[PDB]
Amino acid sequence: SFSGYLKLTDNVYIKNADIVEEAKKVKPTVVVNAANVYLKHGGGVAGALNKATNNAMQVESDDYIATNGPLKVGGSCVLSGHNLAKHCLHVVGPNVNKGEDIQLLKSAYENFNQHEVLLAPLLSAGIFGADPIHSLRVCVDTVRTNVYLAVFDKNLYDKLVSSF
Numbered sequence: 770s771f772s773g774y775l776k777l778t779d780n781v782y783i784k785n786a787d788i789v790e791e792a793k794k795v796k797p798t799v800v801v802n803a804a805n806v807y808l809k810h811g812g813g814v815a816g817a818l819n820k821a822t823n824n825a826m827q828v829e830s831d832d833y834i835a836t837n838g839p840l841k842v843g844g845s846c847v848l849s850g851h852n853l854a855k856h857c858l859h860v861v862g863p864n865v866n867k868g869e870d871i872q873l874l875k876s877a878y879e880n881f882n883q884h885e886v887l888l889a890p891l892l893s894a895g896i897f898g899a900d901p902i903h904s905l906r907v908c909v910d911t912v913r914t915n916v917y918l919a920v921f922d923k924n925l926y927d928k929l930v931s932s933f
């Protein structure tokens with residue numbers, strides 16, 4: 770049900786799209802959220818996905834943290850996808866704006882290998898402060914399962930394709 774994606778490798782595909790609109794159209798088994806360790810979904814991809822769920826993602830996430838404590842940077846958890854997907858895989862990439870180690874970006878993408886197919890953003894890009902060209906290279910060199918990457922910004926999408 771994914772359509773309009775450019776093939777980068779055997780298993781990695783990319784499109785200039787809003788991940789919320791893509792999730793509402795496709796209703797994938799797994800949508801990846803660019804989470805933080807507290808699952809506080811304020812801005813970027815996380816804020817946008819949570820708003821689309823009418824805040825149900827944040828209510829579920831607060832119950833998960835009250836039971837389990839915070840995630841690790843490079844870690845993940847599987848929660849409901851609400852009206853966007855069967856499941857949401859909340860993955861914590863390092864936030865360079867908060868001083869976190871960029872080497873944890875490969876550990877963050879390894880979480881994707883537990884799922885056959887995923888709709889995802891580029892981890893640690895955008896407001897997390899890492900170079901998106903580096904994030905796409907770590908994705909293609911780490912993930913072995915089928916990943917459909919949605920890049921919201923048109924100008925960044927064009928730069929990622931021409932420099933790949």
Ligand SMILES: O=C(N[C@H](C(=O)O)c1ccc2c(c1)CCO2)c1ncnc2[nH]ccc12
Pocket residue numbers: 803812813814815890891892893894895896897901919920921922925
């Ligand atoms: O990475 C950028 N955008 C992506 C995207 O468009 O999907 C994006 C945006 C938000 C976000 C994530 C990724 C993951 C956490 O929230 C981006 N766009 C515009 N100017 C920029 N300068 C440096 C990077 C950058």
